[PDB]
Design an enzyme around this catalytic site. Structure first.
Site, PDB file in Angstrom:
ATOM      1  N   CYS B 133       0.843  -1.190   0.000  1.00 50.34           N
ATOM      2  CA  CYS B 133       0.000   0.000   0.000  1.00 50.34           C
ATOM      3  C   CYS B 133       0.879   1.241   0.000  1.00 50.34           C
ATOM      4  O   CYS B 133       1.461   1.610   1.024  1.00 50.34           O
ATOM      5  CB  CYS B 133      -0.943   0.034   1.192  1.00 50.34           C
ATOM      6  SG  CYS B 133      -2.044   1.460   1.067  1.00 50.34           S
ATOM      7  N   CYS B 136      -0.457   4.233   2.006  1.00 46.47           N
ATOM      8  CA  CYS B 136      -0.212   3.998   3.426  1.00 46.47           C
ATOM      9  C   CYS B 136       1.219   4.354   3.810  1.00 46.47           C
ATOM     10  O   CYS B 136       1.465   5.119   4.747  1.00 46.47           O
ATOM     11  CB  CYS B 136      -0.458   2.524   3.771  1.00 46.47           C
ATOM     12  SG  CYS B 136      -2.088   1.823   3.426  1.00 46.47           S
ATOM     13  N   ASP B 137       2.191   3.782   3.087  1.00 44.86           N
ATOM     14  CA  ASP B 137       3.596   3.824   3.482  1.00 44.86           C
ATOM     15  C   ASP B 137       4.474   4.774   2.667  1.00 44.86           C
ATOM     16  O   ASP B 137       5.647   4.946   3.017  1.00 44.86           O
ATOM     17  CB  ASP B 137       4.199   2.412   3.394  1.00 44.86           C
ATOM     18  CG  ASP B 137       3.533   1.422   4.331  1.00 44.86           C
ATOM     19  OD1 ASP B 137       3.207   1.808   5.471  1.00 44.86           O
ATOM     20  OD2 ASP B 137       3.341   0.255   3.926  1.00 44.86           O
TER      21      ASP B 137
END
Ligand SMILES: Cc1cc2nc3c(=O)[nH]c(=O)nc-3n(C[C@H](O)[C@H](O)[C@H](O)COP(=O)(O)OP(=O)(O)OC[C@H]3O[C@@H](n4cnc5c(N)ncnc54)[C@H](O)[C@@H]3O)c2cc1C
Ligand SMILES: Cc1cc2nc3c(=O)[nH]c(=O)nc-3n(C[C@H](O)[C@H](O)[C@H](O)COP(=O)(O)OP(=O)(O)OC[C@H]3O[C@@H](n4cnc5c(N)ncnc54)[C@H](O)[C@@H]3O)c2cc1C
Ligand code: FES
Ligand code: FES
Lengths: 96, 315, 315, 96
Positions: B133, B136-137
């Protein structure tokens, strides 16, 4: 290195050239053949074929088990030639 | 904006159909869809066995029609990848980079385009440089070297995300990007992107702190190349139900699919499972759509405290 | 895919801005960009006088922002070199190796990084062995020897193209190519490539049939070395408007830039010219971008048969 | 043949060695000098200099006009020494 791949289709045989770093299916399409496919990712068996002669690399494959691989079955959408080889196409229904 | 009656995770035919029915029941409904081009139906080049839809039709056109239907009746469609869930309380909490969404009912509809970790070091460095993701990261890789694996619309969209943070985005594809007929030309014009066409990621390596490098190789060659990297984002398509983000909070049938009862409800009350995440052998779009409607109607009965299931007819 | 409302040739700040505005007008728009690294803005390592963009900014990261903007509003960005145009009829035809693109309006936005033929024999053997487009002529050099002149990202990428056909690719650089810091490593690993570093091309030679050889010489040596070749691909950077692909179909100013009226439209109705291809003394990015905006708005008026120019203001 | 190139920078003079097959700018950087550059391709005049003494070869040059060349100006990023020579750096403003 480019390897001569003879595909044994329902319409008879057809010889193609496939670079060692090209998938069988992609080489065949580039050379005018329509062969069966769905996922094009080694995640189904629509593209199933079966080895007559020679070697391939289908390490990118993720759908056939070891008994099916050991019987000569191959997913042509993620198979690299590692020699000049012969392959029967349209073999999915034998898996079922 | 964040509190809903129904939160649906995944916008394939299962999720879009569930939303169609819940939105018509005037339940406030959201679809959280990672990538509309990444579901099984979306990647079907032609579909000729969907009943009611004749002639030449591509899977992504069919999905668009169903998504448009769900939205026409009030569904909120959001591009949002769900990375976790809190199912501990009656209000379910759904974690995304776009924020935390809450639902009185939750529907898991993520399909079975998932791959088991396949590459040496992938499982070993998950949460330590290996990620699925980018929204996300990605921020944690500001001015750092990263690798994207895969040639598909998800890989392309996630690589675009990482070009806003990374020093360099190494893109590893098994085919030439010319194979998407220009769909990747913007990505490849980005000055941060290095293309490693027709290569395979054979190993991910690092230290205890995390990933430091990858080994890449052209299939059929003996020579490998080491690339220094701190993030490896793997977007390979597979056959398996997308369930890891649920972190084992719902019961699974041995097959790896989500277990559900006659009315599509998981082992956790208030949580439903529909479509190919269930991993039945009946992976067809109209079956998936059917699951979604069943769940929608069980949900309507639950959330409106009805004495019976209510049919949606005549309009 | 190939039929568009607007075809823009060149993806520098002029073309990207034109596309931003035409796409927002909901005109189907394509940018055909030879090489995103080959425009003037792309090669400036620092730009500190683009208004609205403060701090440290490199030209290629500024262009990326403009390109992404155009695409976010619906522009199709395609990496494709235009080698010719048919301007004879209301629908304009744009010839590329990736195919023929059609537009109801055409915008010429190729800038002024062109070098007029500099080398003896270059002009003389044009179309007879001398070429500026490897994706267009490469196939005709299957199992033949070719020469690439220049050290820049275009030269590197075009030489890579030629390694798929040629017997040998002789690469002539004025300095060692590791100077382009890894961009040339793949090319130099190719078994077809002979690197002639720190050498100068003095002359291109041939017969009536075409090129047969080049004369090269190490600076200061005073004795020349002849290399047989049938194709010579020249990729040197200059100061002049890139116009040869237009083949004289639009009028040029005596200075060599494309003539335009106050709304940026050329001598040919339906064809606009913007940015440094016009060869004004005001070669700055925001001026180029301004041209593109003007043309986009004139184009919108033309293509929707409006009564007046329509401003694009926030709603 | 290696030539001695004296560059007259705002920070004072510095002599370098430049092989006849190396560009002035590349030789100077290799020997620790920070001089102005942008395209490094003869397509701008950020690197403009002016010949104090000696001669160079800037045939790879593609931005200066004949009046500017005839006044002693040079693009140092594409100039080869053809003698021992002296060049004033940072001269762009004088071209215009
Ligand atoms: C190549 C191929 C061809 C097919 N052809 C046919 C055919 O001709 N006929 C037929 O009937 N069936 C066909 N199918 C089967 C059909 O596509 C599937 O049965 C059906 O699409 C499954 O629907 P689904 O909604 O459960 O999952 P999907 O359609 O896979 O949709 C899942 C959705 O969840 C999203 N998602 C995933 N993870 C997350 C997350 N963490 N957060 C948020 N969203 C997420 C995805 O982006 C996607 O939008 C084919 C399948 C494939 C792979
Ligand atoms: C070294 C240098 C430094 C500069 N620094 C600054 C600065 O600091 N500030 C400033 O304001 N301006 C600066 N400029 C000027 C500014 O960059 C230009 O005025 C501006 O980029 C011109 O925009 P354009 O779109 O007209 O052309 P370009 O930016 O040159 O873009 C032209 C595009 O067309 C493409 N193309 C060319 N031929 C074809 C073809 N046949 N088919 C398809 N595509 C094609 C090219 O690949 C390129 O993408 C600088 C210029 C240079 C050379
Ligand atoms: S097409 Fe699905 S495995 Fe080959
Ligand atoms: S640095 Fe641009 S011409 Fe020398």
């Amino acid at each position: 290195a480019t390897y001569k791949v003879t595909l044994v289709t329902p319409s008879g045989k057809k010889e193609i050239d496939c670079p060692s770093d090209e998938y069988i299916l992609d080489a065949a399409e580039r050379q005018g053949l329509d062969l069966p496919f769905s996922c094009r990712a080694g995640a189904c068996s629509t593209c199933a074929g079966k080895m007559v002669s020679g070697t391939i690399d289908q390490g990118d494959q993720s759908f056939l088990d070891d008994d099916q691989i050991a019987a000569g079955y191959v997913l042509t959408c993620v198979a690299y030639p590692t020699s000049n080889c012969s392959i029967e196409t349209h073999k999915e229904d034998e898996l079922y | 904006q964040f509190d809903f009656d129904v939160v649906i995770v995944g916008g394939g035919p299962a999720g879009c159909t569930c939303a169609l029915y819940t939105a018509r029941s005037e339940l406030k409904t959201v679809i959280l869809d990672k990538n509309p081009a990444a579901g099984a139906l979306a990647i079907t080049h032609k579909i000729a066995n969907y009943p009611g839809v004749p002639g030449e039709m591509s899977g992504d056109h069919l999905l668009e029609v169903m998504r448009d239907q769900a939205v026409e009746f009030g569904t909120v469609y959001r591009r949002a990848q769900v990375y976790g869930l809190d199912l501990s309380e009656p209000v379910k909490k759904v974690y995304t980079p776009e924020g935390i969404f809450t639902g009185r009912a939750l529907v898991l509809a993520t399909g079975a385009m998932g791959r088991i970790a396949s590459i040496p070091g992938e499982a070993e460095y998950l949460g330590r440089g290996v990620s699925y993701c980018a929204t996300c990261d990605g921020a944690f890789y500001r001015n750092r070297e990263v690798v994207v694996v895969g040639l598909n619309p998800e890989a392309v969209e996630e690589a675009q995300v990482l070009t806003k943070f990374a020093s360099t985005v190494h893109w590893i594809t098994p085919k030439d990007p010319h194979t998407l007929d220009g769909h990747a030309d913007e990505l490849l014009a980005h000055p941060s992107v290095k293309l490693w066409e027709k290569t395979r990621l054979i190993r991910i390596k690092g230290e205890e702190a995390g990933v430091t490098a990858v080994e890449v190789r052209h299939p059929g060659e003996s020579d490998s190349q080491e690339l220094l990297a701190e993030g490896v984002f793997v977007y390979l398509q597979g056959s398996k139900p997308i369930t890891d983000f649920v972190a084992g909070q719902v019961e699974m049938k041995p097959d790896g699919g989500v277990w559900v009862d006659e009315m599509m409800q998981t082992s956790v009350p208030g949580v439903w499972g529909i479509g190919d995440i269930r991993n039945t052998p009946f992976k067809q779009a109209v079956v998936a759509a059917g699951d979604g409607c069943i769940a929608a109607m069980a949900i309507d009965r639950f959330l409106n405290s009805r004495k019976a299931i209510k049919p949606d007819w005549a309009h």
